[PDB]
Design a protein around this ligand. Structure first.
Ligand SMILES: Cc1cc(OC[C@H](C)Nc2ccncc2)cc(C(=O)N(CCC(=O)NC(C)(C)C)C(C)C)c1
Ligand SMILES: [Ca+2]
Ligand code: NA
Lengths: 252, 28, 10
């Protein structure tokens, strides 16, 4: 996260770290949506142009963390993956359209003060909150600058941007399964996701029921925190039929 | 179902340092 | 840079 700040303890208890087993490193963010299911970006797991194609036994999930690099004894929980599901129509060749994946854990994780699932939006939620100017929150352990790494989880609040401005900021073809967020150059405030934040959640707190909803997944960007560029996010509600199909077919 | 309600914040009626910025953007 | 995690999870 560029130009964010340190999270508070327990501020994002649905935050998940995807951790490569060997060599031990941050791969991506993710989010906890139930005791056995983790949501991330497909490009965290599959992106052939950069020779990325991870299998279940290549990774671990670390839940309840705050510190990036430390083993947070008696707080974090580490889970193995039973199976990865990538959207069958994930468009890695062009624009990461439908940039979404699910991971089923081998065993259910116990919830705690530090470990708790986020809500997924329904149609009405999305309609009420996915509006230009409305702000969401992005969290992660990724880089602090485009060109270093944080000691603890970083957090930044960013406004959803008007779709014509999103489209006019890039040469990449945007789809209805994406939205963009960030400040404009004339707005003076700054902030973005960056390398290692991919897959993490874009959340909004409903003013109707006081609950946090995951509206987005950190998807692609061109640089990080560049004037006149915006980060792009997978539109979770638009892909929820797929989420529900997978969990109804394969959940326990 | 208690999704999206944080143990150290909503469950104890404590606000985090910047959630009000989100609420203030939710204008209309 | 990352602290070793318990053997049990590897
Ligand atoms: C896998 C991947 C990831 C990526 O961004 C990851 C990056 C960490 N994501 C964000 C950064 C800042 N804010 C929000 C998100 C950006 C890209 C990317 O560059 N793309 C374009 C690739 C491409 O066509 N490049 C040229 C050079 C051939 C035009 C995608 C497919 C849109 C690919
Ligand atoms: Ca364009
Ligand atoms: Na920008």
């Amino acid at each position: 996260i560029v130009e964010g700040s340190d999270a508070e303890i327990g501020m994002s208890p649905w935050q998940v770290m995807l951790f490569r087993k060997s060599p031990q490193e941050l791969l991506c963010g993710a989010s906890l949506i139930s005791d056995r299911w983790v949501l991330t970006a497909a490009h965290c797991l599959l992106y052939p142009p950069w020779d990325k194609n991870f299998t279940e036994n290549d990774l671990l999930v670390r839940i309840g963390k705050h510190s990036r690099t430390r083993y947070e004894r008696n707080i974090e929980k580490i889970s193995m993956l039973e199976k990865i599901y990538i959207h069958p129509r994930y468009n890695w060749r062009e624009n990461l359209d439908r940039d979404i994946a699910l991971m089923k854990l081998k065993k259910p994780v116990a919830f705690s003060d530090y470990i708790h699932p986020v809500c997924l939006p329904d149609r009405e939620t999305a309609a009420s909150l996915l509006q230009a100017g409305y702000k969401g929150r992005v969290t992660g352990w990724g880089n602090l600058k485009e060109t270093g790494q944080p000691s603890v989880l970083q957090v930044v609040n960013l406004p959803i941007v008007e779709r014509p401005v999103c489209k006019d900021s890039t040469r990449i073809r945007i789809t209805d399964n994406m939205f963009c967020a960030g400040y404009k150059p004339d707005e003076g405030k700054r902030g973005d996701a960056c390398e290692g934040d991919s897959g993490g959640p874009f959340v909004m707190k409903s003013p109707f029921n006081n609950r946090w909803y995951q509206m987005g997944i950190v998807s692609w960007g061109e640089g990080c925190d560049r004037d006149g560029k915006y980060g792009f996010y997978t539109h979770v509600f638009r892909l929820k039929k797929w989420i529900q199909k997978v969990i109804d077919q394969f959940g326990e | 179902a208690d999704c999206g309600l944080r143990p150290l914040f909503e469950k104890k009626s404590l606000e985090d340092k910047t959630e009000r910025e989100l609420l203030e953007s939710y204008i209309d | 840079d990352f602290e070793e995690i318990p053997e049990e999870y590897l």
